[PDB]
Amino acid sequence: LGTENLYFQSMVEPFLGTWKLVSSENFEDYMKELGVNFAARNMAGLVKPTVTISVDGKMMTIRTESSFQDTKISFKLGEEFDETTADNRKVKSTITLENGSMIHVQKWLGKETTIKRKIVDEKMVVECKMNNIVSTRIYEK
Ligand code: NA
């Protein structure tokens, strides 16, 4: 399936690397919408996580490290998977990559949140949305 990954390697390549948070907007209110309490969202909002995006064949891994978590997800694009989030939600996740945007949808208890990533001027721009609450986080590598 080497030959089967020609277009795959092209679309995933811009996302690969060890990204570090440089700026954040409205992340506390986004976390509030997820159901995280004030201490957790206030303290987590102050740190700068490292997000490592890698691939092994067709399997993508995204690792998130901070003072408060060390979590990772491994998945194939477009294939739903079970995920236990850092804030202890048990969700159904599907991650796709179209038009240069990696879109991660999490579904649980009839609720939904979307995490969209794109590369703009070599930076990774991450948009987190839940019920019309939007947070934007920018990372550099
Ligand atoms: Na954190």
Side-chain angles (χ1 to χ4, degrees), residues 2-3 5-71 73-141:
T3 75
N5 258 29
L6 185 76
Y7 292 106
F8 172 93
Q9 62 74 35
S10 183
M11 64 169 173
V12 304
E13 183 177 52
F15 293 92
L16 305 176
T18 303
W19 299 93
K20 182 109 181 300
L21 185 75
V22 295
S23 71
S24 177
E25 180 64 36
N26 213 31
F27 198 57
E28 265 182 83
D29 281 351
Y30 169 75
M31 292 295 272
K32 185 182 180 173
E33 206 62 17
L34 293 174
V36 176
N37 74 0
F38 173 60
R41 65 196 187 244
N42 182 254
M43 290 174 68
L46 285 169
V47 299
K48 297 180 179 178
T50 298
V51 173
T52 306
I53 302 184
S54 61
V55 292
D56 185 358
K58 298 182 186 170
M59 186 79 69
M60 300 284 276
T61 295
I62 299 174
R63 182 188 186 181
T64 301
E65 296 172 81
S66 75
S67 301
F68 307 118
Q69 72 179 104
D70 182 359
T71 61
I73 52 172
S74 296
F75 55 91
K76 283 189 184 185
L77 295 171
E79 299 188 9
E80 184 180 77
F81 61 102
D82 295 309
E83 176 184 2
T84 302
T85 68
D87 64 307
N88 300 291
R89 282 175 290 120
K90 174 75 170 186
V91 309
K92 292 290 194 184
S93 284
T94 309
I95 302 178
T96 58
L97 177 36
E98 294 168 353
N99 294 338
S101 284
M102 192 195 299
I103 298 173
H104 177 179
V105 186
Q106 294 178 332
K107 293 181 182 192
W108 74 107
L109 300 177
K111 299 176 179 74
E112 193 184 286
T113 187
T114 301
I115 301 109
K116 296 180 187 178
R117 307 170 188 282
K118 61 176 175 174
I119 307 307
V120 186
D121 300 320
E122 303 187 298
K123 295 170 195 175
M124 177 172 65
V125 179
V126 185
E127 184 204 75
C128 314
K129 188 174 188 175
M130 188 178 172
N131 303 322
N132 291 119
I133 301 303
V134 176
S135 173
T136 304
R137 274 148 91 77
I138 303 172
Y139 299 76
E140 291 186 35
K141 65 179 175 69

